[PDB]
Design a protein around this ligand. Sequence first.
Ligand SMILES: N[C@@H](Cc1c[nH]c[nH+]1)C(=O)O
Ligand SMILES: N[C@@H](Cc1c[nH]c[nH+]1)C(=O)O
Ligand SMILES: Nc1cnc2ccccc2c1
Ligand SMILES: Nc1cnc2ccccc2c1
Lengths: 406, 406
Amino acid sequence: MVETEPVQGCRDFPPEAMRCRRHLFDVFHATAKTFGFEEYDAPVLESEELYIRKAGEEITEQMFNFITKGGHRVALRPEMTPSLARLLLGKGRSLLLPAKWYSIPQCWRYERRREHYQWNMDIVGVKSVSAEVELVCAACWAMRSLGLSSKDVGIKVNSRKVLQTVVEQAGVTSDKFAPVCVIVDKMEREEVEAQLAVTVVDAITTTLSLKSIDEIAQRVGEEHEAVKELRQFFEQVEAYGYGDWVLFDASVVRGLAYYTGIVFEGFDREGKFRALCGGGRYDNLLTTYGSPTPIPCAGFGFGDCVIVELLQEKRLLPDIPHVVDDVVIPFDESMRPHALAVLRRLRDAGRSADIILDKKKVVQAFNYADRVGAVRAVLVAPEEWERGEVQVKMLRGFAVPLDRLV
Amino acid sequence: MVETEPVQGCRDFPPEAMRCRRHLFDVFHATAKTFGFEEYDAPVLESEELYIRKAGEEITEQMFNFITKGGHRVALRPEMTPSLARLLLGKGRSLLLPAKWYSIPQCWRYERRREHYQWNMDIVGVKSVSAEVELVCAACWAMRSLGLSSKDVGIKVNSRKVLQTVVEQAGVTSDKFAPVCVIVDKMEREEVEAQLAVTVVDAITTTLSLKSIDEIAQRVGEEHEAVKELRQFFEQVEAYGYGDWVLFDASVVRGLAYYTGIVFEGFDREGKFRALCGGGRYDNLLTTYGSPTPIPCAGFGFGDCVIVELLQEKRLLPDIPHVVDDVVIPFDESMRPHALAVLRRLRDAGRSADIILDKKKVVQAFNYADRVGAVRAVLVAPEEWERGEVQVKMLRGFAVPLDRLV
Ligand SMILES: N[C@@H](Cc1c[nH]c[nH+]1)C(=O)O
Ligand SMILES: N[C@@H](Cc1c[nH]c[nH+]1)C(=O)O
Ligand SMILES: Nc1cnc2ccccc2c1
Ligand SMILES: Nc1cnc2ccccc2c1
């Protein structure tokens, strides 16, 4: 007996499970098309240098890396964004901007699950908060398409620029800002104070606990960069009709080094699950990768696990049975040639159809039709075939001419 | 500057290239649904033991394998069939048969390209040639859906049972049959005679060169296992309406150890390309993996490269431009809130729509609309907004009430 279980921390998707995944992905695709994003993809295997950021990020700590026989340092991607940037930087001046790109890559880690699929959506070449508005709306749109409401979930929103100001105004060099976000992201675990030592810590704490935009306007003015952007953001989301889905939370920073402005997280309103999705603006990434001109970017990742737990809890993942329009049933083996001709007509006309492949009695064929979720069974029998007909029976036995089956 | 090229032997899919891939995959999916197959998937990372067959197969020679930090021998799958069998064997008695499963996995090698996507289609629990008929028809159906005809391509068909008889009748132990197929598959390169030594070689040669089923009927009878099956196969394909797509070729064995019966290959009728797809029956695989009951199986793999070359040569891959139904254009920033409300209505009604995200003049917005392949541009201007209207202009400027846009 061979080992039937999959490799450690990896999922099998037999047809039952695959229908569930495909239900989720159909939404990701449909939302992307509704929002005018273009699909792209890149190798799951990337060069390890792509992810060496040196900021203590959990995503790079837990990187599934290995050495080829030719001695190259490579890894199964922990995230997609660096791949996106490589492609963008590769295209250079030939890329029309603004660009809106999406994908649903499988991403990896070594530490629990070692893989997940992650919908990625990114807008490139847009400086204004209109990008983040669109992105946050897309995420809400996908969750609403899955049957969730603003009673079920929300998106917490913030700007890193606020904290940046404090880091700056507290005489704390620009260089160290990314380390601080990464540490402060760990707040939800108790001894984050210890990491920041390795005062300006206090001002960070107070600013995370500020419960409103007015309170941040009071801390650094109604026309700070962050205040105007957040107001603009909330206004646009309100106008698009998703006001009840979004809110301000000063504690949201995200764990990734490269976020420079607005950042956001989806969450369940019952407090039962980790972040449903996550993202932000990252206007400097392409500059760090060597771009001669700064390229504004923003985007998000939306995993395939947390969302499924949430949907299961809310009872929004009813089992989806397989279906097929027709099952064609030879009365016996001598009718197979004729049954095949009929299968051809049905498929020719855009229908999904099986033919009983094995030899079996009609009643067993009918049972089989019902097991595979057939809408209709088409019996091809000698006496009917002479009249130019088949027998049709709906499952969700009148005789029918061949021309009228479609 | 970061390395913009992808890892060795791996392809990037920016949006242009992705539309081409998606055009191909839409066919693979659509054909699978037309033929009633159910989608499945499994980890690209499998345990290396899955592929140790010890028959000199090129697919296992060139296996992209490596050792985890925990010391496990794993590999990026060179093919899908073993993964399929693992899943099937895992399900055991709970799996309803017959089962028809498909997927489009990315598969790997280390040696040229190191990755490709491969449509897999497999029928499980069907002893009769009706399985192989369906499979071969599915492959033809996909190629016809891509615009090819029986003048462009065909499927060569054969049974390994013929050669098995010769191997047996030539006092050559059953054990060594798989090695022989793998060697004889190399015939198309000159010194295959040398490998078979490492006589019965002559009888193998003659039987590969037999140009018809009657000639094989003359060599071992009109009621050999292989003769009846091949006749049944050609009859069923004829009846389904794909007679001009298929033909007999005694030289076709395929390179994989596990094929036991009918085997087949798609090919271009100009002799310019390698095999388009390939498959056969493999009734013993699950028995070798430890199944207590023999499970008949048959299937095929259909790669994503050769087919694309062929389609390019035949001029059947016209560039596919991106499209989107509407682009919404704020007359200026003060109209953004109103433009957003309109974007909402359009998307609500099932349309794909952008809104100009950046700040720009109307003429530039219109140009942008044309670049991204918009069918329609929707200008939201102050004077029209007061009349409850927008300006609409078709690209493939009459005023319109909001209700009538959808
Ligand atoms: N790469 C981020 C998500 C993201 C996409 N684009 C920008 N951010 C993550 O893995 O959490
Ligand atoms: N695994 C085979 C194709 C196949 C699928 N099912 C049976 N055979 C190949 O890679 O060539
Ligand atoms: N880079 C990451 C992040 N989160 C994950 C969650 C589950 C499985 C794999 C993952 C890989
Ligand atoms: N196992 C295989 C077989 N053929 C391939 C062709 C191209 C790239 C990768 C491949 C992997």
